[PDB]
Symmetry: D2
């Protein structure tokens, strides 16, 4: 599953439909990024630029011109074809092939952007620009506007209005097309297979980074070369560190390991967390904390639907957590009073859910306290956790336990679809899986 040329074109037209007549929208590619000295990180296209193009080169700018309410056209600035650069660093789309390949009306060399952009903006009323996103893009836009402001003797005029297109575009991204959902479904399946593999390979004495290697190998073999975020493999006390990415420790018999990892597939993020015993068997204490986190997740999965909100479902989770922690003696008091004082927060200190898409923490307005009413087409995570610090003032057997369990879902007309339920999370199913792998 992928997003095709025709869909990128639909998205461009949908933006144009929201634009004022006599306007242009400017969407810039990500800069290349240095890793060390002359070596660069593998290129990651800007998500919004990607959303409108599926084009994975730097030094590119998409310009959508809406001349009036019936007439509009697109211009791409992109790197020229060049024999030498290409023998060295790889093939480039160039200007001749871009209109057909990407479905844009015209393509021009990026090297000509300062000579051409002001001419495209001349006489328009509005420019849509994500100001502050990239310095290089701001310099280009500001230069063009300055040329226009200062060019009345050449009969040039600058648009007086600049509108940040990010609110509009991010609202577009918040609601996934069926094709986007198919891509995310595949991302979830690829990520789930990776997590299953990690559970089947995990043994005491392996390093945390060994499970990262298994996971990334599984991503790669399904054509998801890169993770959507830095993989977390937190065994023992490291599980209580939320974005532990060192993954440098030997995994001990008797500890849990929390793995949070997700692929990037055709631009889209998977995002799964599973926590499991390194030796294949939960201790009583581990199981007691695990069951509360799993109940939180299972309840959330039953509830998420159109018409509720992250805030509302979070309230149910908080009650489940406070109740379970009181029962174990980790919290003490009256449940409702404890809820009223947010007594869960030392152990569950993050949000239950974030939007998911071209970024793992995807764009889109949440509303105050994530109160926005859910509608079909929204994609979000569900990730309750409990983290009991090594020095927490709690019954000793719970200290140093960090558990999160995270699935990715799409809101549908009838509730939700779980994209990541193909990797197990019930404790008895985890143990069975690991027992089977451990027998060879």
């Amino acid at each position: 599953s992928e997003i095709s040329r025709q869909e990128f074109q639909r998205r461009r037209q949908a933006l144009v439909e929201q634009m004022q007549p006599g306007s242009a929208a400017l969407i810039f590619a990500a800069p290349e990024v240095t890793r060390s000295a002359d070596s660069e990180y593998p290129y990651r296209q800007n998500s919004d630029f990607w959303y409108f193009t599926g084009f994975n080169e730097p030094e590119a700018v998409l310009v959508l011109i809406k001349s009036d309410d019936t007439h509009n056209h697109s211009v791409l600035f992109n790197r020229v074809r060049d024999l030498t650069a290409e023998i060295w660093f790889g093939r480039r789309l160039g200007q001749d092939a871009a209109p057909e390949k990407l479905g844009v009306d015209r393509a021009l060399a990026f090297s000509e952007i300062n000579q051409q952009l002001y001419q495209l903006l001349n006489g328009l009323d509005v420019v849509y620009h994500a100001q502050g996103e990239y310095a290089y893009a701001d310099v280009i836009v500001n230069s063009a506007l300055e040329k226009l402001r200062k060019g009345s003797r050449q009969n040039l005029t600058a648009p007086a209005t600049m509108i940040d297109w990010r609110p509009v575009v991010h609202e577009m991204r918040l609601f996934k097309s069926p094709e986007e959902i198919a891509v995310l479904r595949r991302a979830g399946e690829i990520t789930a297979m990776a997590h299953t593999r990690a559970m089947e390979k995990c043994r005491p004495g392996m390093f945390e980074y060994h499970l990262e290697g298994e996971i990334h190998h599984e991503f790669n073999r399904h054509g998801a070369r890169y993770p959507s975020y830095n993989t977390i493999v937190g065994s023992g006390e490291n599980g209580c560190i939320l974005h532990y990415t060192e993954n440098e420790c030997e995994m001990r018999d008797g500890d849990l390991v929390l793995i949070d990892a997700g692929c990037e597939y055709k631009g889209y993020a998977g995002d799964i967390t599973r926590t499991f015993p390194v030796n294949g068997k939960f201790t009583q204490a581990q199981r007691e904390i695990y069951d509360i986190v799993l109940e939180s997740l299972e309840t959330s999965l039953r509830l998420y639907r159109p018409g509720t909100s992250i805030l509302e479902v979070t309230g149910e989770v908080v009650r489940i957590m406070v109740s379970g922690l009181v029962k174990l003696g980790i919290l003490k008091g009256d449940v409702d009073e404890l809820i009223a004082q947010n007594a869960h927060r030392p152990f569950f200190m993050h949000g239950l859910s974030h939007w998911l898409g071209l970024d793992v923490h995807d764009v889109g307005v949440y509303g105050q306290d994530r109160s926005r009413i859910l509608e079909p087409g929204m994609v979000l995570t569900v990730e309750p956790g409990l983290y009991i610090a090594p020095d927490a003032e709690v019954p000793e057997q719970y200290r140093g336990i960090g558990i999160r369990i995270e699935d990715d879902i799409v809101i549908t007309e009838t509730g939700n679809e779980n994209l990541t339920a193909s990797v197990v999370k019930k404790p008895e199913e985890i143990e069975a899986l690991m027992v089977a792998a451990r027998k060879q």
Copy 2:
């Protein structure tokens, strides 16, 4: 093998020994780097900062103060310990533990750098600063100097002299300690095992990126989490593109695949290229080009020693190439005349060797045309190649063939040691390896 605290301290003292009395050297950590939106790339410490510290955090600055010819001391600025940041994003060294851990005299919070740096530079004659390396570092240094210049009423004085320490430090890095050579030896072995694995796993119909996944998995399992540069897997015509990193094509029965990949192990780069038949058997044409590149490499490996140079060895390679290409009819004419007109250059268009170390294209002065005389302790690559474009005006059977074969060596008192000879390169040994793997 690794580099220890005591060695980082030796390097600091060796810099200090080269410093003027009444001076301070400022060495800044790399900034964190955005991958997309709020997600960052896995952190890569600046190589020179690493060289003096082995410390893998951002927002850190090493200050070496040489008060006079007998007295000197070190101050580290680094991130404070902070409960919340640490629960979220991970553990930090902090100020209390840094002096013992890193072997510095004093540690201060990075948040205090603007309040403290000018006081450390007050009254010194010289500041050593790699100006232009990082914008954030330049801002900090320029602010401190401005405070001093403008603070005569507070009895402050700025050092009038600023010296770029990069020439001195890069000359230090050019000559490896025995411990560094041990680390590089391990990098070479890890990288070689990865390349062997790729040869054993490769089958027609696999995607180029599948071999990248095998390679990166092998790096990881030996504790080299990250590659030292973006892996190249160039099959068929893609082999003629020097830094082909798309690795997106299905590998065809009958094509060669060129794999250029290297691990980063304790900061140090491996860098190996092997080219081999996708189906396990060189065609006659492939073998004919391969033999010229292999002869170039084997001859270079015999020759490299103290007292020669990359330039001198390159001349021998050029003769081997021109000779072989004439013999095959790819070039036509008199060998010596062809050499005199650099007739090899359409097919061998890059350098034979680059320095290797904490960067894959390592620091250090090459001399004009890489004429610097080699000495023991220098580490370099040897990477002849021949690339015959799909449309080259040559006998048809050679078109679209891209071959490079690259080993990493250390110059020793008696010649060189090949760090990467544990992965095969003789064509009959490649075929035997692949025949054996292909039988299961």
Copy 3:
């Protein structure tokens, strides 16, 4: 005559009336400017900031908030009162006195602008900002918007729309109130008295800068401390250099001197040019060129009225010039053909008229080729000139003659009012004035 508090308030309200509901306009003061080292030029307030405030301090920002269509209010950021700064550098308005003095609703310390501006912009739809006018102002606005964009967890929202208020404000400035016309009338009278004085004081052997001194002394004595632009005193060949400001030469018996000078009175510019014989008597050649320039000006003064344009009046001037130059043999050919080839341009190479107000080259849209139809309340200059280079291919006696004659006018319902006719320009009146002064 001046502009009062109530008028600045009217202007603020007129801007607000043009603003969208749910918006704020930000108007920044000019930065102080270094002359040398720690010495600054005398402060000149930004013209648009001045237009809305009459406030002559730096580090000030006017914020006009239009909450909706009935409710609006103003906030000033300005320097705090401070005993020491004030003993040293002078009195400051401060926060307590500003609301009454300036007629703003609230005043806050400039030192708090970054802590307060984002709170004023939170939740608005539109921000009006003259982007690119000042770097310091851009930094402040961009920081505030970034805080808002990034502050959704604090329930902050940034306005997505930024509109340059300069087009609207400059259209306001283009049409003068009766009070503004009274100020400009006084500026014209002060400037005229200065030019009369220069004519009465001028003698061969005086330096050009001596007339500048007379002029600036006369400005000052009427309470116009500063000129509105750098004074030009171009004698002999220097008259052919349009913005000759060196004023360094001894004025010779037999040469003309061109003086272009204007006062700045309550923010408003005068702008007068007179050219006259250094020795009090035009030569025949000088008089011949002078008469053409004077005819051009007198005709322009008869013509300028509502319903014509600078372009239309320029055409009449061009015909007068071509005709006169043909008659003298400076041009040769058919007048209409010469006009059609713009043959006057080597001798008259600038515009006839520019708008006049708070800047000498005042703001406001001219239309293509200055074709905008004139309306009452517009204020402009009328400044024909002829400049015959020392090496021009023309009858010898005309070489090195530079003449401009410039008056300032206001368009009225019935034509125009000449604000600067109190300094003579008819050649016989110039000679009479100078003859009288030269007798003592």
Copy 4:
């Protein structure tokens, strides 16, 4: 008196003599400065650039190359000759005439600086650059060094050492040549004539700015077009504000007026303060404060000589002030105890003396608390003052009195020469002068 070509050349050679072999010094012109919109302030050349050139154009850079200990040469970058720019904005020196005019070896177009500077710095060991002085200059230098650092394949090398030439050059400027002293002597005489004129013209009912106009007219007529700093005319309570430049008030019968004004003559500053009765007659109270300030100045003038210091002479002044203030009841206590508690500071809150030259607050190291031992050739001001605030807790008759009296001196082998004693300061001489002028 002026500074000639040969002296600018001597200064260049004296810098070169202090430079390391294999080095270049870069001295940049001041940028032009905006006054409002498209109008600029009258150009003021950077003092250090002026010191080495006497050249009053922007977009110019002096490059002094010291190839080794015997061979050196100079290159100027400066604006090209251009017909149109010159018809408009004035004459430019250009490249052809510069070597002879300025006495430099070579001149190149400023437009070529980025193409040429790196070639001049290639292979040198040291670059002398006043980093942080001007942004435009820093950009140019940083670009050149970056080209060199990154150009090893083109056999380019950057100098690793950058030295701020300001300490060396400012020490040069601290010691005046006999020619510089002659220029300063003339500056002092011009300034003194201006102050005499102000005393002779001053009448109750005139505005403070009227005396500014008289002063600036007198500067101008002697060929000092511009003041060296913004003129202060502080009558009544305004005299207690140290840099009162508003000069906006009507001068009252019964008040003193403090005038601090100085010309700029051939680049060099005068700096004189005189305080006198607006009505020509000191009141008893005014005279009582005046006598203490005059005693302070007369004593300082007797004392200043080689071998003393500003600090030492300041101590004598402080004693004079404390003594006089005790005698009048403004201070109460034991003189020595009062001195020990710096009890004078509410009334005398600034320094007694600053260096004087191409800047009014001239460059040069003062030593801690201005303790540097004075030597012949140093030029400084002597400016005791007493300022009694309107609300000071002192005998009523002294409130609102601000008096400073300031002369400019040169240290000589035998003491000092007073450059500004030609304007009176004894109270009886002030009254006599004013009585005579007031009679007509």
